[PDB]
């Protein structure tokens, strides 16, 4: 990869944010700690523990 070029496509931007950041197929690791719940994805938080 040499250059990153903008295409200004908001709906595609949203779909990529969903795939990489919000609802990744496999999230980055986050080990549980006394101060945390153990979820590794935002998708999991609202699907299973909404308030």
């Amino acid at each position: 990869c040499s250059i990153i070029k903008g295409t200004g496509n908001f709906d595609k931007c949203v779909s990529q944010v969903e795939s990489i950041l919000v609802a990744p197929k496999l999230p980055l690791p986050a080990n549980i700690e006394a101060a945390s719940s153990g979820f590794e994805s935002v998708d999991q938080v609202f699907r299973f523990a909404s308030s």
Binding site: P24, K25, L26, P27, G38, F39, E40, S41, D43, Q44, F48, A49
Partner: protein, 51 residues
């Protein structure tokens, strides 16, 4: 051959999409599948030793 006498029954029912323990974390479903108990499969098929 009775389904209730299958030694894989407790692990196969544990490794189910209907189990919150499995559902609540992204990795959990894959951890079951890699231990040859696929959560998306129906019970009798989930325990069958194929071929």
């Amino acid at each position: 051959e009775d389904v209730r006498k299958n030694r894989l029954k407790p692990l196969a029912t544990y490794c189910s999409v209907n189990n919150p323990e499995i559902s609540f974390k992204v990795t959990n479903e894959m951890q079951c599948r890699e231990n040859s108990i696929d959560p998306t499969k129906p019970l009798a098929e989930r325990m069958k030793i194929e071929n």
